[PDB]
Amino acid sequence: STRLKIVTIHQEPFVYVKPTMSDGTCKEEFTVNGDPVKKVICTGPHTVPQCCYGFCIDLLIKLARTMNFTYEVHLVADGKFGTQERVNSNKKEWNGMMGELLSGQADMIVAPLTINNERAQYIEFSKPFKYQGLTILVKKGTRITGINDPRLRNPSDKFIYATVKQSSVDIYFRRQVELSTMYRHMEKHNYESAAEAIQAVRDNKLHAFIWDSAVLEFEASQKCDLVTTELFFRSGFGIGMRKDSPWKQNVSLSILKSHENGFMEDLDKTWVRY
Amino acid sequence: DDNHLSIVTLEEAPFVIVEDIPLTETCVRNTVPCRKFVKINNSTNEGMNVKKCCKGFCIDILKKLSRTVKFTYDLYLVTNGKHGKKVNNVWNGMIGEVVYQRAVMAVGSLTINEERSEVVDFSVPFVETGISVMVSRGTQVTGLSDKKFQRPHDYSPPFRFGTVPNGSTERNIRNNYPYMHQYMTRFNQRGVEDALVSLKTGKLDAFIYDAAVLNYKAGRDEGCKLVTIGSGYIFATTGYGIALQKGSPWKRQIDLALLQFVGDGEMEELETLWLTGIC
Ligand SMILES: N[C@@H](Cc1cc(-c2ccc(Cl)cc2Cl)cc(CP(=O)(O)O)c1O)C(=O)O
């Protein structure tokens, strides 16, 4: 009852995934600024114990202490955030973290999980633990104005842009019929994960990567051959729970309190800005 | 009649703008009817209900919500306090109206926070805000947590920066950054107007205030020289939300509707319509 299964996903800087040491523990280390890096064991893809740390892990720890629950963390098996798909036949089904939460394989999603109508139909989101939005990543020297650029709006195989498969951004483009032209360009090129897309830009096999700014601005800061556009859309990350969670109220109260007393400020400085 | 809803709001341009009721005894154009209990003098509880007309960013939201969630309302302006404060164990303002069941919802420039969330529920946020900084273009700072603010005597010349006191900005700063708070009291500004001129006339280097307010004024600056920091540096980020009664049967649909608006682009239209300025 009191022991929560936590699902999360690999997504620097919000979640880092590294191997355990020989003895199955995690190498102790400190942040650039001298804070102890808190680490947790997290099983994941066939499956094996690993080390997780980061913004969202720190947030999980503060939640676990504040509301007094214990936890066990694992990486989402299919590696995806979560979109809704028709089964084939009548039944629709969620994949990614969304499906694992809905199926009971997880009790709580702690991850840079975008809040949106689509998902909020079937689950309870907390108030945002992070406000951010969507922007575009390109190799330095690629000239693009943003989401309205003609090379984006009148697409061709001469300039390829893409997002992450079965993600909130995928939903965002599938959502509006006016973005139809953009989508079945993207659907042809979408990548299995944020990491593979970012890499594909550096390798010039991808011309523009459309994604969360809190991730993309971090990447551009560690990787100076990469740059971003301008937020063309605003959205937030929230904790994901099932409708019946007794935890939902206190999770949100905790997040609000953490915004107001500078705890989030601490996390944002440690992970998101450096 | 479970579908006609008492709804409370508060004048605060440009989220809520109050106007008189013109020629025909009816609210026209893009405005909606809203009543105000107008006091007889300043030393009395006596008053009179007066028919007013309301419009603005939050009123358009209310309009969009009413059509989508399918409800009707009698809109009224709160007269006992403003947004809401616990005073002698008692919530006043819009919050109180909701808490003591005079309103089903509060709509306006109402900040989502922990304390209020204890006694009311909030919708999802529909306007981002928090504590931000405004400077004259040129001046270099990051947000609140910049050392130039925290330890201003480490730099020469020391920054001069202030806020409008007695509100949630000062109270937040005093609870998180005691010395910075102590320091900036000598630079306090009586109003937002006086602060902007203080900035423009070099008597102030930085104005620390509500994010949503600062973006709006920056968008309207004569000369486009007053600029706010990047949104990534806003401190204690939060948003305006609609307050509902604890365990309200309406929250789910209001939430889903607001998220639909954002997803569909309608919200950006609205911010362009009401909040986006020329700068
Ligand atoms: N949102 C708040 C109310 C609230 C409103 C404003 C404001 C001021 C000028 C203009 Cl033109 C427009 C606005 Cl919206 C400013 C603050 C900032 P401060 O308190 O430090 O005075 C504030 O708190 C609440 O929900 O309690």
Give the C-alpha separation, A107 to A100, whole Å. Answer: 8
Helix (H) or strand (E) run with residue A75 in it: strand A70-75
Is residue A271 within 8 A of residue A132, CB to CB? The reply is no
Our answer on whether the CB atom of B83 is closer than 6 Å to any ligand 1 atom is: yes
CA distance B225 to chain A (A): 20
In this complex, do B176 and A175 lie within 8 Å of one another by their Cβ atoms?
A: no
Give the C-alpha separation, A162 to A178, whole Å. Answer: 17
Q: Tell me whether A234 touches chain B (CB under 8 Å).
A: yes
Counting from 1 in the atom list of ligand 1, the atom nearest the Cα of B169 is 20
Pick the CATH number of A131-234 from 3.30.1310.10, 1.10.3130.10, 3.30.1490.100, 3.40.190.10: 3.40.190.10
In a shared domain, residues B112 and B146: no
Q: Could you tell me the two tokens for A250?
A: 């206190």
Q: Residues in chain B, how many?
A: 279
Query: In sequence order, what are the residues at sequence separation of 6 or more whose Cβ sits closer than 8 angstroms to the Cβ of residue A193?
Result: A10, A79, A164
| Angle (CA) A90 A95 A97, round 5° | 145
Give the C-alpha separation, A93 to A83, whole Å. Answer: 8
In a shared domain, residues B134 and B230: yes
Read off the DSSP letter of residue A241.
E
Give the C-alpha separation, A119 to B250, whole Å. Answer: 18
Helix-then-strand count for chain A, H and E: 10, 15
Closest C-alpha to ligand 1, atom 21: B167
Cis ω for the linkage preceding B157 (within 30 of 0): yes
Please, which residues 138-157 of chain A have a Cβ atom closer than 8 Å to chain B? none
In this complex, do B238 and A253 lie within 8 Å of one another by their Cβ atoms?
A: no
What are the beta bridge partners of residue B54? B18, B32
A47 labeled part of a ligand binding site: no
What are the beta bridge partners of residue A44? A48
Read off the DSSP letter of residue A169.
H
Is residue B18 within 8 A of residue B50, CB to CB? The reply is no
Give the C-alpha separation, A94 to A105, whole Å. Answer: 13
B123 labeled part of a ligand binding site: no
In a shared domain, residues B157 and B139: yes
Q: Could you tell me the two tokens for A125?
A: 């989101």
Which residue in the block uniquely carries the two structure tokens 């937002």?
B192
Q: Could you tell me the two tokens for A215?
A: 């991730």
The secondary structure of A173-216 as a DSSP string is HHH-GGGHHHHHHHTTT-BS-HHHHHHHHHTTS-SEEEEEHHHH
Point out the residue among A116, A217, A264 whose CB comes nearest to the CB of B263: A116
Give the C-alpha separation, A167 to A157, whole Å. Answer: 22
Q: Provide the 3-class DSSP secondary structure of residue B27.
A: coil
The radius of gyration of chain A's CA atoms, rounded to the nearest angstrom, is: 19
Compute CA distances B95 → A254, A259, B89, B183, whole Å.
20, 21, 13, 32
**Nearest Cα residue to A188 out of A167, A157, A153, A148:** A157
Q: Tell me whether A230 touches chain B (CB under 8 Å).
A: no
**Residue from B168, B189, B209, B216 whose mutation best tests the ligand 1 pocket (most atoms within 8 A of CB):** B168
In a shared domain, residues B173 and B63: no
What are the beta bridge partners of residue A159? A156
Query: In sequence order, what are the residues at sequence separation of 6 or more whose Cβ sits closer than 8 angstroms to the Cβ of residue A149?
Result: none
Our answer on whether the CB atom of B111 is closer than 6 Å to any ligand 1 atom is: yes
Is residue A237 within 8 A of residue A126, CB to CB? The reply is no
Q: Best of A127, A179, A263, A270 to disrupt the B interface by mutation (most B CBs within 10 Å)? A: A127
The secondary structure of B130-196 as a DSSP string is EEEEEEETT----STT-HHHHSGGGSSSPP-EE--SSSHHHHHHHHH-HHHHHHHGGG--SSHHHHH
Q: Could you tell me the two tokens for B180?
A: 């910075």
- Resolution of the deposited coordinates, in angstroms? 2.3
Query: Residue B173 maps to which CATH number?
Result: 3.40.190.10
CA-based nearest residue in chain B for residue A255:
B114
- Share in percent of chain B as helix, strand, coil (round to 5): 35, 25, 40
Helix axis angle, B251-264 to B266-274, nearest 10°: 80
In this complex, do A234 and B236 lie within 8 Å of one another by their Cβ atoms?
A: no
In a shared domain, residues B228 and B241: no
Compute CA distances B128 → A30, A110, A130, B145, whole Å.
33, 22, 11, 19
Q: Tell me whether A256 touches chain B (CB under 8 Å).
A: yes
Give the C-alpha separation, A195 to B105, whole Å. Answer: 44
Q: Tell me whether A2 touches chain B (CB under 8 Å).
A: no
In a shared domain, residues B121 and B253: yes
Give the C-alpha separation, B75 to B108, whole Å. Answer: 12
In a shared domain, residues B30 and B112: yes
What residues of chain A lie within 8 A of the CB of B235, using their CB?
262, 265
Q: How far is CA A50 from the centre of its chain?
A: 18
Give the C-alpha separation, A111 to A76, whole Å. Answer: 11
In a shared domain, residues B265 and B150: no
In a shared domain, residues B242 and B120: yes
Q: Could you tell me the two tokens for A255?
A: 């997040």
In this complex, do B145 and A176 lie within 8 Å of one another by their Cβ atoms?
A: no
Which residue in the block uniquely carries the two structure tokens 């320091």?
B183
Strands A233-237 and A130-139, bridge-based pairing: antiparallel
In a shared domain, residues B256 and B149: no
Burial tier of A125 (Cβ tally within 10 Å: 0-12, 13-18, 19+): buried
Is residue A235 within 8 A of residue A130, CB to CB? The reply is no
Strands B72-77 and B86-87, bridge-based pairing: unpaired
Q: Determination method here? A: X-ray
Identify the domain containing residue B170 by its residue range: 130-236
Which residue in the block uniquely carries the two structure tokens 């007889």?
B40
In a shared domain, residues B25 and B109: yes
Structural domain count, chain B: 2
Burial tier of B160 (Cβ tally within 10 Å: 0-12, 13-18, 19+): middle
- How far, in Å, is the centroid of ligand 1 from the Cα of B101? 24
Half-sphere exposure (Cβ direction) of A126: Cα atoms closer than 13 Å: 34
Identify each DSSP E strand in chain B by its residue range.
4-9, 17-19, 32-39, 47-55, 72-77, 86-87, 90-91, 105-106, 120-122, 127-136, 161-162, 206-210, 226-228, 235-240, 243-245
Q: Best of A265, A270, A274 to disrupt the B interface by mutation (most B CBs within 10 Å)? A: A265
Residue B148 backbone phi and psi in degrees, to 5: -50, -25
- How far, in Å, is the centroid of ligand 1 from the Cα of B210? 7
Read off the DSSP letter of residue A131.
E
Give the C-alpha separation, B62 to A173, whole Å. Answer: 27
Q: Provide the 3-class DSSP secondary structure of residue B22.
A: coil
Q: Best of B237, B244, B276 to disrupt the A interface by mutation (most A CBs within 10 Å)? A: B237
B121 labeled part of a ligand binding site: no
**Nearest Cα residue to A167 out of A104, A95, A75:** A95
In a shared domain, residues B183 and B242: no
| Angle (CA) B208 B214 B220, round 5° | 140
Helix (H) or strand (E) run with residue A101 in it: helix A96-103
CB atoms within 10 A of CB B121: 21
Residue A263 backbone phi and psi in degrees, to 5: -60, -50
Give the C-alpha separation, B57 to B17, whole Å. Answer: 9
Helix (H) or strand (E) run with residue B16 in it: none
| Sign of the dihedral defined by the CA atoms of residues B92, B96, B101, B106, in that order | positive
In this complex, do A115 and B124 lie within 8 Å of one another by their Cβ atoms?
A: yes
Read off the DSSP letter of residue A271.
I
Q: Tell me whether A273 touches chain B (CB under 8 Å).
A: yes
